Symmetry: C3
Subunit: 336 residues, 3 copies
């Protein structure tokens, strides 16, 4: 028996709070030079169907810091297209590593992997969502709360394209009872299915959501968040096309930040295209927190790995009598 | 001085029994949550000239579990003179494995390296598969039968895995059959090596295209039909040679016997060498077999490194002196 | 605050002696089976823009031996769409130390300038400083009977490769006598020679760049490298034979002309039958495989030095460490 981390839709507000608290406590230990060896001798399979810097390095570093090891399985090493291949691969890998992550081209691949594997599976980004980004961004907002405001009192505005990161930000903010806005142009907004999921979250949490092309919607934002304009890895929009759609209205510049408010913080999942979605002035300015945010990709990944492996061990406990017997038998064999 | 693991031809029945016993004891420790740190701070160079999932992940995981680390050197990263590469790597890692296109490459690597070398599969044999398969057969012995009483039938192409299965089964005193079509059977040189094994072990071997040869099998084993990595047989060509006679289906399993277990080294081509019904059925053990790739690799790594240390022992007086000198240097 | 290792030009003779002594003491500990865990739980990002065997394996092995881990990044992470500043800031939050083998020297200079963690040059088109330290360790271990380091003559034969220049830089820094024996159009240039001259004004060493075959006479170490030039733009076999063969082939005649006790060095890989003959590279006076081993020797010393420097400049607060450890333990004991 295992638990997966494919979407925050299967996690409650209270569970997300626990993950944040766990992640931040591990962070404070490591920041002061204590590395808790919570994944000693454990192996993570890391399946990447696309390129990655932040996610890949975070997983590999996290495993080392916690006493285990991450194995990088590059694009083309593992095919996740067809159910039959995915079932066989899942069953082989489940016997060979303790935990799995995958960054996939199509969301059904990560859903299928999690369904077939008997070990925990983590979504490292798909075309649909990006749940490790969600947890990292939540950690970051908690660390940068406005003076005298609670999390649920905050307004978070995503500017631009309806990327998987846009949707994921909507999912986590509404799950935590916050106020979310997607400020984006017609034809590039979160769709009806996206909005129904955000509505369902708000019906439980007391938060709110709005999807609009009204420029005034940035006003009062505590966090202003953006992402690239070129769309999906496999099928990018050209420079000329994306400028036509988004520029200059959706460029996060100092004017937009000032319209949001003097204390509004700037966030971006990275990598950023400077001179497009954001200007140098904003991303390098005093109210940019996007490099703290990048660090918190590692923060959240450490907490997730520990949570999922602790869950696995609680559901599949070791028998300490048989452990002692097995250790003694091995030692006797190697001595005699 | 070192020892290598290039072929089971250089290992006795007693040595293979020791490797099985070591592998299974490590397995039982880890299964119950004790990870023996027998390779602490040791580095394994992993040279892959061809793709791999099972072998590669097994080596990398094994090193982590035992307290060391495996370095994945992907296809094209290391050109394989072989003498120069061997001498360089021998100074930079503690142990080496390689999956190679041509068997002479692994023989040359082992000859030139001054550290232990493990064959991760060649065009000739696949000795880590042999040990894993042996572990699996031991764990799944038929009720009231000894290993040497068992019959193992390989169906289909004369792959390096086919030959390797022949080598290990005959080495352990078992009864081996290659059921395959004319032009795709184990050759005269293969059979002479199997005969030599049987003269020592009291086992037997048979190579035949007679469909009745599966009868009485305790283990029925198969592999893909598309041949070597660098020169695959097309779908049309391989179906013409092997289908349907050599497809392991439920009819063939029933002909072998109600209790016959199904094995496959993986990956499998469902609908060719084996049907979904068989590979997913109650008598399939091929996923236990896949797990035992890691089982056997852990045992091999420990055996070879223990052997290396016995032949090249550490001087504890010089160790103590070196430690003190380093500590004084870093303090002062 | 950090220190980098991009060029030995920023290191004094006394600092290079310290690195040699540290490297050799770690070597003697490991040789006798004591692995000092000086980089426990630390992560090294290894950026390779080009192929490598010796350098790559040395870094990955060194990290394991010292209790940490090296992450191999293939042309996964590009130095492109995202600026060097942005990539440097992201990686600085995710690993503890960085190395890179780069096509163009400015890339490693920029990475070092922008990163807030130590950066090591794993070879560029300009220099190869880890090779320098490994070669120095090797010369120290193989000093001629009754000679001091500064009494030795080192002759590099052939093309003016980055290894040629680097050998010039380290030998002149240590007060030795350096010669580049190479043909017109393939010699160290005026800028190279000005840097060697500056080193010699401080050290009392000497340098010479010449196409005179008699310049090998009296050499204690004779060093060579391949003839095919840079990774991205190799010289053909026909072209390079025309330039270098047979005059610059290191054969037994040349070794005898240098001296009966002259040792042969080569950074590897070698093209047998071109720059060197089988007889020389496999002969009794070849030390190039000890030299190859000392790539690992020197890399271990460098990693320890740079991380010790980093920790001295950024010390852990032991009171806050104790508090963070306690809070984590309480959280894991009491919460769920
Ligand atoms: N919408 C963007 C999201 C990238 C998020 N970035 C990360 O996760 C950091 P990484 O890619 O370096 O791991 C896209 O589809 O590319
Ligand atoms: N005859 C087959 C044997 C494959 C063996 N499989 C394994 O070792 C599992 P892996 O390739 O994932 O490591 C062939 O030549 O392809
Ligand atoms: N002039 C040579 C220098 C190679 C140095 N070799 C090494 O550093 C060993 P490696 O490449 O295996 O890491 C060139 O430009 O290729
Ligand atoms: C088993 C036996 N102690 C050997 O070694
Ligand atoms: C040597 C010296 N203890 C350092 O610093
Ligand atoms: C997960 C969290 N401990 C709840 O319960
Ligand atoms: Ni690794």
């Amino acid at each position: 028996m295992k638990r997966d981390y494919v979407t925050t839709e299967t996690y409650t507000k209270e569970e997300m709070h626990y993950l944040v608290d766990l992640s931040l406590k591990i962070k404070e230990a490591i920041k002061n030079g204590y590395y808790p060896q919570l994944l000693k001798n454990k192996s993570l399979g890391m399946i990447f169907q696309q390129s990655s810097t932040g996610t890949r390095v975070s997983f590999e570093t996290a495993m080392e810091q916690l006493g285990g090891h991450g194995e990088y399985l590059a694009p083309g090493q593992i095919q996740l297209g067809g159910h039959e291949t995915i079932e066989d691969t899942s069953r082989v890998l489940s016997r060979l590593v303790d935990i799995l992550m995958a960054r996939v081209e199509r969301h059904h691949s990560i859903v299928d992997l999690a369904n077939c594997a008997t070990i925990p599976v983590i979504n490292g980004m798909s075309d649909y969502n990006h749940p490790t980004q969600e947890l990292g961004d939540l950690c970051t907002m908690v660390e940068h709360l406005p003076e005298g405001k609670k999390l649920e009192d905050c307004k978070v505005v995503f500017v631009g394209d309806a990327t998987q990161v846009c949707f994921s930000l909507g999912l986590i903010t509404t799950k935590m009872g916050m106020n979310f806005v997607h400020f984006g142009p017609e034809g590039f907004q979160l769709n009806e299915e996206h909005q129904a999921k955000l509505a369902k979250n708000c019906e439980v949490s007391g938060g709110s959501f709005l999807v609009t092309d009204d420029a005034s919607s940035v006003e009062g934002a505590d966090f202003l968040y953006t992402d690239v304009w070129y769309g999906l890895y496999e099928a990018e929009l050209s420079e000329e096309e994306r400028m036509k759609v988004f520029y200059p209205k959706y460029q996060v510049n100092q004017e937009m930040m000032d319209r949001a408010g003097a204390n509004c913080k700037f966030m971006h999942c990275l990598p950023a295209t400077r001179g497009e979605e954001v200007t140098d002035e904003v991303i390098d300015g005093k109210n940019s927190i996007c490099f703290d945010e990048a660090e918190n990709r590692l923060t959240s990944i450490r907490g997730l790995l520990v949570y999922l492996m602790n869950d696995y061990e609680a559901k599949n406990p070791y028998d300490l009598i048989k452990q002692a017997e097995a250790k003694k038998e091995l030692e006797v064999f190697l001595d005699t």
